[PDB]
Amino acid sequence: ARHKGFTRRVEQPRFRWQDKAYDCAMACREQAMEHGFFGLNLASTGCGKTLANGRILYALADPQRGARFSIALGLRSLTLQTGQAYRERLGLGDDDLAILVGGSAARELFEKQQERLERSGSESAQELLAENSHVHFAGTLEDGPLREWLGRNSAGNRLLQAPILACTIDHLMPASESLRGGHQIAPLLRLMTSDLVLDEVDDFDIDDLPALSRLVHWAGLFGSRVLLSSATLPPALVQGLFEAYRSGREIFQRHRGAPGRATEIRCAW
Amino acid sequence: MNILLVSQCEKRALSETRRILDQFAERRGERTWQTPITQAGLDTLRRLLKKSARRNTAVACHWIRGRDHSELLWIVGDASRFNAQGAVPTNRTCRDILRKEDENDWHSAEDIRLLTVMAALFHDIGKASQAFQAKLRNRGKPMADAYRHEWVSLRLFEAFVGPGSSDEDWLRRLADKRETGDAWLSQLARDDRQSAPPGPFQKSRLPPLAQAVGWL
Amino acid sequence: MNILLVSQCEKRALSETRRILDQFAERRGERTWQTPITQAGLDTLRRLLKKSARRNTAVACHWIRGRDHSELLWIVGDASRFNAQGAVPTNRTCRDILR
Amino acid sequence: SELKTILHSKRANLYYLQHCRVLVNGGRVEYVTDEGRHSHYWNIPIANTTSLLLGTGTSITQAAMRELARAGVLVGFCGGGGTPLFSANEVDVEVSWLTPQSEYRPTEYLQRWVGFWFDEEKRLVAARHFQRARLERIRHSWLEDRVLRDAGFAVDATALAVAVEDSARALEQAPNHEHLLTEEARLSKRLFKLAAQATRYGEFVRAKRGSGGDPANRFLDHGNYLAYGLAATATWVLGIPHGLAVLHGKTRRGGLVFDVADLIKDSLILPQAFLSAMRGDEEQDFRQACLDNLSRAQALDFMIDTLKDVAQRSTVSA
Amino acid sequence: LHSKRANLYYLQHCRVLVNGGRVEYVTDEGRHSHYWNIPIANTTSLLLGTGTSITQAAMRELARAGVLVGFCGGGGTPLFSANEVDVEVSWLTPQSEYRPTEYLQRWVGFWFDEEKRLVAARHFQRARLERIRHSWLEDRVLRDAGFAVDATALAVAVEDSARALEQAPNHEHLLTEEARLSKRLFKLAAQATRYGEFVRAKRGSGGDPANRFLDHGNYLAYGLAATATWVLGIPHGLAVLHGKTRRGGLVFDVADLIKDSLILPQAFLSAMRGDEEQDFRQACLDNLSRAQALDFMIDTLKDVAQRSTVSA
Amino acid sequence: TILHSKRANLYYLQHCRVLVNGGRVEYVTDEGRHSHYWNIPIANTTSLLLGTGTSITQAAMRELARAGVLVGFCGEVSWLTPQSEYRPTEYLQRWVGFWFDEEKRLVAARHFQRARLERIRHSWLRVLRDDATALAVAVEDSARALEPNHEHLLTEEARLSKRLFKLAAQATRYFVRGDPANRFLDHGNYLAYGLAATATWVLGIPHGLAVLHGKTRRGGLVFDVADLIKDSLILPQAFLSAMRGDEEQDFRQACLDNLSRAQALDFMIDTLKDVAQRSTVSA
DNA sequence: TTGCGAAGGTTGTAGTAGTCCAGGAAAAA
DNA sequence: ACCTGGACTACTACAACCTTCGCTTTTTGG
C-alpha cells in the first residue's frame, strides 16, 4: 500500500499512455470490484509494458487496504536475473517481491518415494512443493494467519506471505491440472487470496492452450481478476478466454456478494 | 427567482465568503442568505466566488422552483460538506459504530463446514481392515494392497447408509446415539466376489448428500 | 407551502429546539431547516416550540408565498435578535460608535 | 395526536437507504454512514415521512423502531437495487414489511371490504373496476400532463386511442380471472411498444426477474419498488390487511400491495424510466426525478380514493 | 417462551447477525446463552425487546426459513411493530414458507349475524366473571399479599352479575351489567385495601396514585392483548362486544378478560406500599407471567370460533 | 451587472450611521448597551433614502457610487448622482433636442397625463378587490378635458386627481388632501419620487429640465415622472393601508411589494423612451 | 470478545470583540 | 480634534471523548 512509484507521474512524453491507462483504472475501479474484470494490453514492444501492468493493477485495488497480485511468464524456466529485472522496472525492494526460481518438476520422480512411503500409510505428509524450488524473499514471516498448517518456514508460507510474486505459469498450473497428491494447495490458496497477470500468453504452444483455458476458468471461479498482456493476440484466443472467465465468474457470484445481481464483466482494452 | 445560499466555510475562508455574498443578499442567519435575484446575478456570483475560493470553501445554492419543490443548483468549493440533496451531517465521530468486520458474506461457509466435518470423521475408516493392520505390523517385504483404503472406506459407508434410502433416514439413524449394532454390515457388497456389484454412485444406490460425502 | 426556519437559540435552548425541529425537516445548515409542510403541521410545530421554550430560545419562520416575494410568519422567544423583516445583525459592539 | 398531526397523504419524504445504521441519537432518529476516517449522522424527519426501504448492509435498533411506529411510519426490507429480497425456484419475496400495531385505524372500510372478499363474482367486479380506473388514469397522464410533453414525451394520439379502446372492449367482456390476466399482459406489452416509440428509443424488449442489463430494464425494476412503498402505506392507512388480494394473489404473498400498485406503475414510471435512459442518467437521478413526479401528481391520494370507491361500490351493489 | 401454545420467544441484550450463512446472537454469556436452542422453522416467532438490533441479512435468512419477527417493549409489552399473517383459502395459494392462518374465515363467518355476536359476548362475560373468582379467592400468594377479600360480598356480587348477564336481551343491558359489576368490584377492593373512597377519573385526570396505577396496568394489558390477536391472525377492528364504530374494539374486549382479575389488586397493593413506577411495572409483569394470561387469552379466542363452527 | 429594473430593494433609513466595515457597506443603529451592524446589499439595490438623524462617511459614498447605486437626502429631496460612470448619450441628445424648442416642449406634456390615465384605467380593473360605469365616466371626462395651455392641463390634472381621490374614499368608506391618509400619501410620494429619480438617471436625461412642474420647484422632471405611478398606485394603496390601521413601516412594505409586483420601473422607463421618440418624430 | 442510549465531567478549538498603532489607492477604447 | 485595516490579545460558546447505569415513558376514551 501507499507505493509512491506506482503513483508518481511520468514526464517523458513517450510514457504518457501509461498515465492514461492508470487514469482509466481509477475510472473503472468501482464497478470492477463488484462485477469482475477482464483486461487486455496491446501496447507494442519497447513501450515497457511491465510498469504499465503494475500501475494499472495497483490502481484497481482499494487504496485504504493496499494491493496484491502475481505475475506469470510463459517461460519454461525463470532465471534470477529476470526476477531482479522485474524488481528494477517496478522499483520494489527485496522485502516486497518474492521470486520463484527454477522450473516445474517431473511427475514420475515423486512416485518411487511415495511407494516407499506407502509402507507407513502417511501419504498425507508429502511436501506441498518440490525440493528444487526456492523462494527468494526476506520479509516478515512471523504473523502468518495460516502459519500453523503450512509450516513455519516451508516454501508454502513464504509464497503466501509475499504481497507480490513473480513466477512462471508452469508453477500455477498445478492448481487445476494436478491429479495426485496435494500439489494444488498452495497455488490454489494463492489464486483465492490475490490477483493474476498473464504475460506473453500466445508464446504457448497450440496444444497447451486447453490447460491455460482451464486455469483461467478456475481463476475466474474463485474471485480473481485476470489481465492478459501481449501484442499478437489473435481474436479466437481472446474470445475463448473471455467466455471461460465469464463461465467461471457466474458460479462464484452465487456464493459471494449480494445475491441476485447480474453478470456484467468489466472488460477493457 | 428566489434562492437560498448556505455557507459551511471555516477559518479565513469564512470572512472572504461573507464579504463576497453580503453584496447580493440580506443576512438571514449567521451563515444563511436568501433573496430574489436574476439569472445574471447568479452567474456573476458563481464566478466571483470561484475566483477567490480556497481549500476551506463550501457554499451551496438552492432554488425554490415552484410549489412544494426545490432543487440544488451547484456547490462551490469542497463537496464533502454536503450530500447529493444538499443536506449537511448533524454530528461526527471517529469511533466506528458500524463495526462491519463481524459479519462476512460467505453464503455457503456452513454447508462446506458440515460436509467437510462429516467427510473427515469417516475418511480413513478403511484402515481398520486386517490386511492394512498386517501391513502396518509387517516389517518384511511389502505387498501392494489389493484395494486402496479409501475404496474400502467408501464401501463401508455405502453399506451403513443402506441402499435406496432417503437422506433423512440415515441421518436420523446416525444421530440416535442409543442405536448401536453391527447388523448393517451384511449389506457390504464386496467387490472380490465373482459377480461385480453395481457401482455405489448409481442412481438407486445412494441419496444426493450421501454421494456428496462419498466423493470427498 | 414551503418554509425556511432559522434558529438563533443559545446555550441550553439550542439543544431543545434542535431536537424538536429535527422531526419535521431536513437540515440545510448548522442552524437552518427547509422543507414543504401543511398548515396543520406548522401549527403543531409552533405549539410544540412554544410549550417547552426557554429564555434563550429564538426561532423564526419565513414563507415563500410565490415568485419573488417572501413573508415573515412569526418568532418564538426573544425578538431582539431579529429585526422587523427577519434579518439578523452582522456584528455587535459594546463600544459606543454612533455618538 | 402530536406526531400524527400531518395526514399520510400530505407528507413529503420517502427514503431508500443503503450501507447505513439506523439508531436513536439524542432523542432523534438518525442513520449513520461511513466516510473512512469519520462517521456522519444524518437526521430523518419521521413526522414528514411515509415509508422506509432498507437495502444492503443495513441494520436498525429497537429504540428506533419504537420511535418510528409511534409516528405511523412503515418500514420494509428489500433486496438492494431493484432485485428481490430473496428468490429461489418459484418463490419470490420483494419486501418484508413491518407494519405498526400500536395504532388503531378506522373500522368502516375493513368491514365493508371483508363483506365481499369471500364472494367470487364480487371479486371479479372489483377487479374490473380496478382495471377501468387504471386505463382512465393512463389516458389522463399520457394525454393531459404537459410536463411530460415539455420534457420530450411525444406519442401519436391515434395509436394510443386505438390501443386503449381495444383494451377497454376486451377487458369489460372478460368472463373469468385468467382472461383478465392475459388481457392485462397484452395491454402491458402494447404500452411498452408505444412508450419505446414515443422517445425514439429504438427496439426494446422487457426482461423479467431483474435479469436486464440495459438501462431501461434496470430503471423500471428499481422504479417498481417506490410504487410498492406507496401502495403499502395506502393500504395500511385504511386498516385493510395486506393479504386480501383480489387479482394478483395467485402468484404472490400479500398481493393487495401489488394490485393497488398497478394503478400507478404505468402512468408515471414508464415514461420517466425511458426519459432517464435516453438522457443517460444514473440510478440516483432517476429516483429523484420519479419521486418528485409522484409527489406532484399526488399518487397516494389517488390510491386511497380508488380503494374507498371500490369498497363503497361493492357494498352498494349488494 | 411466553406461551407454550404460541411458540413465541423473547430476546433481549443481543445483536442478531449472520456469519457464513447462519444467524448468530452476540451477547454477554458468550456461547452459552440459551438463544442457541431456538428452532428456526415454520413454527417459531421472535420478539425483540430492550437493547436489541437486527441486520438486513439476518431478516433475509429468517424470511427464507419462514419465521415471523416483531419488536416488543420492555418485558414483552406493548407491541410496537411486527410482520403480518396471511389468510388460508382454497384460492390465494402462493408458494412461500410462512404458515398461514384460518381463524379469520371462521370469525367472519358469524360476525355478521347479530345473535351469534350476542352469544360470543355472553361467552366473553362468562369467562371474565369466572376468572375474577379464581384471582380474588384462590390465590394464596395474593392472600399473603395483604389485601383482604371478603368471601361473602364477592360471592354475592359475582352471583348477582351472573344472574344479570344470563338475562341481558340486548347489548346495552350487557354493558350496564358490566358497569355495575365493575363498580361493585372497585368498591369491594377499596374497602379491602383501606384506601378509602376511590373513583375512575376520565381522561386519566385522577391525581391519586390509584389512578396512575390503574392506567399503567391498563396500558400493559392492552399491549398483551394486541400480541394475542396478532399471533392468532384476527384484525383489531372486528369488535365483538363494543360498538361497531369504536376503533380497536377487539383488543379491549380480549384485554378485559384479565384486567379486572389481575391489574386491580396490584394497583391498590402498590398504592398502599407507596412504591415507585418501575417496581409496580415489574410486579405487574411478574403476576401476568405467573398467571399465564396470554395462554388463556389465546385459548378463549380459539374456543369461541370452535363453538361457533360446531353449532353451525 | 444586474439591470436596474431587476434590482429588488429600496431602503428608507432613520436614526442610523452609514459606514464601511471590513470592506462592506453597513448602517449602524443603537440598541442600548450594545450597537448593531446591518448590511446593505449594494449590488441588489436601486436607490437609498436617508431620513432624519443619519450621517454618511465618504468611504461609503465611494463604494455606493462605484456600484452604481443612487443616494439622496430627505426630510424637497436632494439627490446625489454617481458621476463616476459613463452613460449612453443618444437618448440625452434626443431629449435635449426636444427640450430646446419651447414650441416642441409644449407638445407631449399632456401625453404623459394620457399615459398615466390609461395606466390608472388598466390597473383599477384584482388586488384592490382583496363602480365601473362611474370610473369610465371619470376617465372619459378627464381625457376630454386634457385633449389649450399648460395651466389648463395642470388644472385638468388636479381635477382628475380630486375625482380619483373622491372615488377611492367612496370605495374605502372611511377625503381631504392630520389623518393617516395624508401622511401615508406623503410617504408614498417620497418613495415614488425616489423611483422616478432612479429611472431618470438610468435613462441619462438631465434631472433639472422638467415638463410641467418646472416653474413649481427644482428638479421638476423627477416629480413629473413620479406622478405617473403616484396616481396609478399610491392613492389606493395608501387609502387601503390607512383603513387597515397599519403602521408606517407596514404601509411602506406593502407599497414596495405592490410596485414590485407591477413592474413599475419598466413601465416608467418605457414610457419615457416612447415620449422621447414621439417628440423626435414630431420634429 | 462484550446490548443500547442518557447524563455528567473533562478537554480542546474556533470564533468574537477590544486595544493600539499607521496610512491615508483603483490604472480607457 | 477623521476614518478603516491590520496585528495582537483575551476569553468565552461549542463539540467530542470517557465513564458509569438504568432499562420507563401520559399512556384514555376507548
JSON list of N, CA, C and O in Angstrom, two decimals, chain F residues 145-178:
[
{"chain": "F", "resi": 145, "resn": "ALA", "atom": "N", "xyz": [-61.16, 66.65, -21.08]},
{"chain": "F", "resi": 145, "resn": "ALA", "atom": "CA", "xyz": [-60.58, 67.89, -20.56]},
{"chain": "F", "resi": 145, "resn": "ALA", "atom": "C", "xyz": [-59.14, 68.06, -21.01]},
{"chain": "F", "resi": 145, "resn": "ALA", "atom": "O", "xyz": [-58.73, 69.16, -21.39]},
{"chain": "F", "resi": 146, "resn": "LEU", "atom": "N", "xyz": [-58.35, 66.98, -20.96]},
{"chain": "F", "resi": 146, "resn": "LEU", "atom": "CA", "xyz": [-56.93, 67.08, -21.26]},
{"chain": "F", "resi": 146, "resn": "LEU", "atom": "C", "xyz": [-56.69, 67.38, -22.74]},
{"chain": "F", "resi": 146, "resn": "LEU", "atom": "O", "xyz": [-55.94, 68.31, -23.08]},
{"chain": "F", "resi": 147, "resn": "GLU", "atom": "N", "xyz": [-57.31, 66.61, -23.63]},
{"chain": "F", "resi": 147, "resn": "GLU", "atom": "CA", "xyz": [-57.09, 66.77, -25.06]},
{"chain": "F", "resi": 147, "resn": "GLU", "atom": "C", "xyz": [-57.51, 68.17, -25.51]},
{"chain": "F", "resi": 147, "resn": "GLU", "atom": "O", "xyz": [-56.78, 69.14, -25.30]},
{"chain": "F", "resi": 148, "resn": "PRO", "atom": "N", "xyz": [-55.82, 73.93, -23.69]},
{"chain": "F", "resi": 148, "resn": "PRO", "atom": "CA", "xyz": [-55.12, 74.81, -24.62]},
{"chain": "F", "resi": 148, "resn": "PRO", "atom": "C", "xyz": [-53.70, 75.14, -24.17]},
{"chain": "F", "resi": 148, "resn": "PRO", "atom": "O", "xyz": [-52.75, 74.99, -24.95]},
{"chain": "F", "resi": 149, "resn": "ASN", "atom": "N", "xyz": [-53.55, 75.57, -22.93]},
{"chain": "F", "resi": 149, "resn": "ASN", "atom": "CA", "xyz": [-52.28, 75.97, -22.36]},
{"chain": "F", "resi": 149, "resn": "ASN", "atom": "C", "xyz": [-51.85, 74.98, -21.29]},
{"chain": "F", "resi": 149, "resn": "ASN", "atom": "O", "xyz": [-52.61, 74.11, -20.87]},
{"chain": "F", "resi": 150, "resn": "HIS", "atom": "N", "xyz": [-50.60, 75.13, -20.84]},
{"chain": "F", "resi": 150, "resn": "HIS", "atom": "CA", "xyz": [-50.09, 74.27, -19.78]},
{"chain": "F", "resi": 150, "resn": "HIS", "atom": "C", "xyz": [-50.88, 74.45, -18.49]},
{"chain": "F", "resi": 150, "resn": "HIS", "atom": "O", "xyz": [-51.11, 73.47, -17.78]},
{"chain": "F", "resi": 151, "resn": "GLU", "atom": "N", "xyz": [-51.29, 75.67, -18.18]},
{"chain": "F", "resi": 151, "resn": "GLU", "atom": "CA", "xyz": [-52.06, 75.90, -16.95]},
{"chain": "F", "resi": 151, "resn": "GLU", "atom": "C", "xyz": [-53.38, 75.14, -16.98]},
{"chain": "F", "resi": 151, "resn": "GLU", "atom": "O", "xyz": [-53.79, 74.55, -15.97]},
{"chain": "F", "resi": 152, "resn": "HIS", "atom": "N", "xyz": [-54.06, 75.14, -18.13]},
{"chain": "F", "resi": 152, "resn": "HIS", "atom": "CA", "xyz": [-55.29, 74.36, -18.25]},
{"chain": "F", "resi": 152, "resn": "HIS", "atom": "C", "xyz": [-55.01, 72.88, -18.06]},
{"chain": "F", "resi": 152, "resn": "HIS", "atom": "O", "xyz": [-55.80, 72.16, -17.45]},
{"chain": "F", "resi": 153, "resn": "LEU", "atom": "N", "xyz": [-53.88, 72.40, -18.60]},
{"chain": "F", "resi": 153, "resn": "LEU", "atom": "CA", "xyz": [-53.52, 71.00, -18.40]},
{"chain": "F", "resi": 153, "resn": "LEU", "atom": "C", "xyz": [-53.33, 70.69, -16.93]},
{"chain": "F", "resi": 153, "resn": "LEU", "atom": "O", "xyz": [-53.80, 69.65, -16.43]},
{"chain": "F", "resi": 154, "resn": "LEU", "atom": "N", "xyz": [-52.65, 71.58, -16.20]},
{"chain": "F", "resi": 154, "resn": "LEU", "atom": "CA", "xyz": [-52.44, 71.36, -14.77]},
{"chain": "F", "resi": 154, "resn": "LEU", "atom": "C", "xyz": [-53.76, 71.35, -14.02]},
{"chain": "F", "resi": 154, "resn": "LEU", "atom": "O", "xyz": [-53.97, 70.51, -13.13]},
{"chain": "F", "resi": 155, "resn": "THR", "atom": "N", "xyz": [-54.66, 72.27, -14.37]},
{"chain": "F", "resi": 155, "resn": "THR", "atom": "CA", "xyz": [-55.97, 72.30, -13.71]},
{"chain": "F", "resi": 155, "resn": "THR", "atom": "C", "xyz": [-56.75, 71.02, -14.00]},
{"chain": "F", "resi": 155, "resn": "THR", "atom": "O", "xyz": [-57.41, 70.47, -13.10]},
{"chain": "F", "resi": 156, "resn": "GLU", "atom": "N", "xyz": [-56.70, 70.54, -15.24]},
{"chain": "F", "resi": 156, "resn": "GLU", "atom": "CA", "xyz": [-57.38, 69.29, -15.57]},
{"chain": "F", "resi": 156, "resn": "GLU", "atom": "C", "xyz": [-56.81, 68.12, -14.79]},
{"chain": "F", "resi": 156, "resn": "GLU", "atom": "O", "xyz": [-57.55, 67.26, -14.30]},
{"chain": "F", "resi": 157, "resn": "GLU", "atom": "N", "xyz": [-55.48, 68.07, -14.66]},
{"chain": "F", "resi": 157, "resn": "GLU", "atom": "CA", "xyz": [-54.86, 67.00, -13.88]},
{"chain": "F", "resi": 157, "resn": "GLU", "atom": "C", "xyz": [-55.28, 67.08, -12.42]},
{"chain": "F", "resi": 157, "resn": "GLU", "atom": "O", "xyz": [-55.54, 66.05, -11.78]},
{"chain": "F", "resi": 158, "resn": "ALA", "atom": "N", "xyz": [-55.34, 68.29, -11.86]},
{"chain": "F", "resi": 158, "resn": "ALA", "atom": "CA", "xyz": [-55.79, 68.44, -10.48]},
{"chain": "F", "resi": 158, "resn": "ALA", "atom": "C", "xyz": [-57.23, 67.97, -10.32]},
{"chain": "F", "resi": 158, "resn": "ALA", "atom": "O", "xyz": [-57.57, 67.32, -9.32]},
{"chain": "F", "resi": 159, "resn": "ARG", "atom": "N", "xyz": [-58.09, 68.30, -11.28]},
{"chain": "F", "resi": 159, "resn": "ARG", "atom": "CA", "xyz": [-59.47, 67.83, -11.23]},
{"chain": "F", "resi": 159, "resn": "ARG", "atom": "C", "xyz": [-59.53, 66.31, -11.29]},
{"chain": "F", "resi": 159, "resn": "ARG", "atom": "O", "xyz": [-60.31, 65.68, -10.56]},
{"chain": "F", "resi": 160, "resn": "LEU", "atom": "N", "xyz": [-58.72, 65.70, -12.16]},
{"chain": "F", "resi": 160, "resn": "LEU", "atom": "CA", "xyz": [-58.70, 64.24, -12.25]},
{"chain": "F", "resi": 160, "resn": "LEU", "atom": "C", "xyz": [-58.25, 63.62, -10.94]},
{"chain": "F", "resi": 160, "resn": "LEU", "atom": "O", "xyz": [-58.83, 62.63, -10.48]},
{"chain": "F", "resi": 161, "resn": "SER", "atom": "N", "xyz": [-57.22, 64.20, -10.32]},
{"chain": "F", "resi": 161, "resn": "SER", "atom": "CA", "xyz": [-56.75, 63.68, -9.04]},
{"chain": "F", "resi": 161, "resn": "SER", "atom": "C", "xyz": [-57.82, 63.83, -7.96]},
{"chain": "F", "resi": 161, "resn": "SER", "atom": "O", "xyz": [-58.00, 62.93, -7.14]},
{"chain": "F", "resi": 162, "resn": "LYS", "atom": "N", "xyz": [-58.54, 64.95, -7.96]},
{"chain": "F", "resi": 162, "resn": "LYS", "atom": "CA", "xyz": [-59.61, 65.14, -6.98]},
{"chain": "F", "resi": 162, "resn": "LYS", "atom": "C", "xyz": [-60.71, 64.10, -7.18]},
{"chain": "F", "resi": 162, "resn": "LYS", "atom": "O", "xyz": [-61.21, 63.53, -6.21]},
{"chain": "F", "resi": 163, "resn": "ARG", "atom": "N", "xyz": [-61.10, 63.86, -8.43]},
{"chain": "F", "resi": 163, "resn": "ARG", "atom": "CA", "xyz": [-62.13, 62.86, -8.70]},
{"chain": "F", "resi": 163, "resn": "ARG", "atom": "C", "xyz": [-61.67, 61.47, -8.27]},
{"chain": "F", "resi": 163, "resn": "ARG", "atom": "O", "xyz": [-62.44, 60.71, -7.67]},
{"chain": "F", "resi": 164, "resn": "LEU", "atom": "N", "xyz": [-60.41, 61.12, -8.57]},
{"chain": "F", "resi": 164, "resn": "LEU", "atom": "CA", "xyz": [-59.89, 59.82, -8.18]},
{"chain": "F", "resi": 164, "resn": "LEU", "atom": "C", "xyz": [-59.85, 59.68, -6.67]},
{"chain": "F", "resi": 164, "resn": "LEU", "atom": "O", "xyz": [-60.16, 58.61, -6.12]},
{"chain": "F", "resi": 165, "resn": "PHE", "atom": "N", "xyz": [-59.46, 60.75, -5.97]},
{"chain": "F", "resi": 165, "resn": "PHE", "atom": "CA", "xyz": [-59.44, 60.71, -4.51]},
{"chain": "F", "resi": 165, "resn": "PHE", "atom": "C", "xyz": [-60.85, 60.51, -3.95]},
{"chain": "F", "resi": 165, "resn": "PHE", "atom": "O", "xyz": [-61.05, 59.74, -3.01]},
{"chain": "F", "resi": 166, "resn": "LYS", "atom": "N", "xyz": [-61.83, 61.20, -4.52]},
{"chain": "F", "resi": 166, "resn": "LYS", "atom": "CA", "xyz": [-63.21, 61.03, -4.07]},
{"chain": "F", "resi": 166, "resn": "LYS", "atom": "C", "xyz": [-63.68, 59.60, -4.29]},
{"chain": "F", "resi": 166, "resn": "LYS", "atom": "O", "xyz": [-64.31, 58.99, -3.41]},
{"chain": "F", "resi": 167, "resn": "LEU", "atom": "N", "xyz": [-63.40, 59.04, -5.47]},
{"chain": "F", "resi": 167, "resn": "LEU", "atom": "CA", "xyz": [-63.81, 57.67, -5.76]},
{"chain": "F", "resi": 167, "resn": "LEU", "atom": "C", "xyz": [-63.14, 56.68, -4.82]},
{"chain": "F", "resi": 167, "resn": "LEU", "atom": "O", "xyz": [-63.79, 55.75, -4.32]},
{"chain": "F", "resi": 168, "resn": "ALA", "atom": "N", "xyz": [-61.85, 56.87, -4.56]},
{"chain": "F", "resi": 168, "resn": "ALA", "atom": "CA", "xyz": [-61.14, 55.98, -3.65]},
{"chain": "F", "resi": 168, "resn": "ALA", "atom": "C", "xyz": [-61.72, 56.07, -2.24]},
{"chain": "F", "resi": 168, "resn": "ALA", "atom": "O", "xyz": [-61.91, 55.05, -1.57]},
{"chain": "F", "resi": 169, "resn": "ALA", "atom": "N", "xyz": [-62.01, 57.29, -1.78]},
{"chain": "F", "resi": 169, "resn": "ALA", "atom": "CA", "xyz": [-62.61, 57.44, -0.46]},
{"chain": "F", "resi": 169, "resn": "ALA", "atom": "C", "xyz": [-63.96, 56.74, -0.40]},
{"chain": "F", "resi": 169, "resn": "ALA", "atom": "O", "xyz": [-64.30, 56.11, 0.61]},
{"chain": "F", "resi": 170, "resn": "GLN", "atom": "N", "xyz": [-64.76, 56.85, -1.47]},
{"chain": "F", "resi": 170, "resn": "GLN", "atom": "CA", "xyz": [-66.04, 56.16, -1.50]},
{"chain": "F", "resi": 170, "resn": "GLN", "atom": "C", "xyz": [-65.85, 54.65, -1.42]},
{"chain": "F", "resi": 170, "resn": "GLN", "atom": "O", "xyz": [-66.54, 53.98, -0.64]},
{"chain": "F", "resi": 171, "resn": "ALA", "atom": "N", "xyz": [-64.92, 54.10, -2.20]},
{"chain": "F", "resi": 171, "resn": "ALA", "atom": "CA", "xyz": [-64.70, 52.66, -2.17]},
{"chain": "F", "resi": 171, "resn": "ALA", "atom": "C", "xyz": [-64.26, 52.21, -0.78]},
{"chain": "F", "resi": 171, "resn": "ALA", "atom": "O", "xyz": [-64.73, 51.19, -0.27]},
{"chain": "F", "resi": 172, "resn": "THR", "atom": "N", "xyz": [-63.34, 52.96, -0.16]},
{"chain": "F", "resi": 172, "resn": "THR", "atom": "CA", "xyz": [-62.88, 52.61, 1.17]},
{"chain": "F", "resi": 172, "resn": "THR", "atom": "C", "xyz": [-64.00, 52.73, 2.20]},
{"chain": "F", "resi": 172, "resn": "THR", "atom": "O", "xyz": [-64.14, 51.88, 3.08]},
{"chain": "F", "resi": 173, "resn": "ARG", "atom": "N", "xyz": [-64.80, 53.80, 2.11]},
{"chain": "F", "resi": 173, "resn": "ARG", "atom": "CA", "xyz": [-65.88, 54.11, 3.04]},
{"chain": "F", "resi": 173, "resn": "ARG", "atom": "C", "xyz": [-65.35, 54.67, 4.35]},
{"chain": "F", "resi": 173, "resn": "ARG", "atom": "O", "xyz": [-66.01, 54.51, 5.39]},
{"chain": "F", "resi": 174, "resn": "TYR", "atom": "N", "xyz": [-64.18, 55.30, 4.35]},
{"chain": "F", "resi": 174, "resn": "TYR", "atom": "CA", "xyz": [-63.59, 55.83, 5.58]},
{"chain": "F", "resi": 174, "resn": "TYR", "atom": "C", "xyz": [-64.54, 56.80, 6.28]},
{"chain": "F", "resi": 174, "resn": "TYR", "atom": "O", "xyz": [-64.96, 56.57, 7.41]},
{"chain": "F", "resi": 175, "resn": "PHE", "atom": "N", "xyz": [-62.83, 62.52, 1.16]},
{"chain": "F", "resi": 175, "resn": "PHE", "atom": "CA", "xyz": [-61.50, 62.70, 1.74]},
{"chain": "F", "resi": 175, "resn": "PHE", "atom": "C", "xyz": [-61.00, 64.13, 1.54]},
{"chain": "F", "resi": 175, "resn": "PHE", "atom": "O", "xyz": [-61.43, 64.83, 0.63]},
{"chain": "F", "resi": 176, "resn": "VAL", "atom": "N", "xyz": [-60.08, 64.55, 2.40]},
{"chain": "F", "resi": 176, "resn": "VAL", "atom": "CA", "xyz": [-59.46, 65.87, 2.34]},
{"chain": "F", "resi": 176, "resn": "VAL", "atom": "C", "xyz": [-57.96, 65.68, 2.20]},
{"chain": "F", "resi": 176, "resn": "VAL", "atom": "O", "xyz": [-57.34, 64.99, 3.01]},
{"chain": "F", "resi": 177, "resn": "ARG", "atom": "N", "xyz": [-57.38, 66.30, 1.18]},
{"chain": "F", "resi": 177, "resn": "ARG", "atom": "CA", "xyz": [-55.95, 66.17, 0.91]},
{"chain": "F", "resi": 177, "resn": "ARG", "atom": "C", "xyz": [-55.17, 67.31, 1.57]},
{"chain": "F", "resi": 177, "resn": "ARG", "atom": "O", "xyz": [-54.43, 68.03, 0.90]},
{"chain": "F", "resi": 178, "resn": "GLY", "atom": "N", "xyz": [-53.77, 65.72, 9.18]},
{"chain": "F", "resi": 178, "resn": "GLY", "atom": "CA", "xyz": [-53.81, 65.05, 10.47]},
{"chain": "F", "resi": 178, "resn": "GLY", "atom": "C", "xyz": [-54.18, 63.59, 10.36]},
{"chain": "F", "resi": 178, "resn": "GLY", "atom": "O", "xyz": [-53.74, 62.76, 11.16]}
]
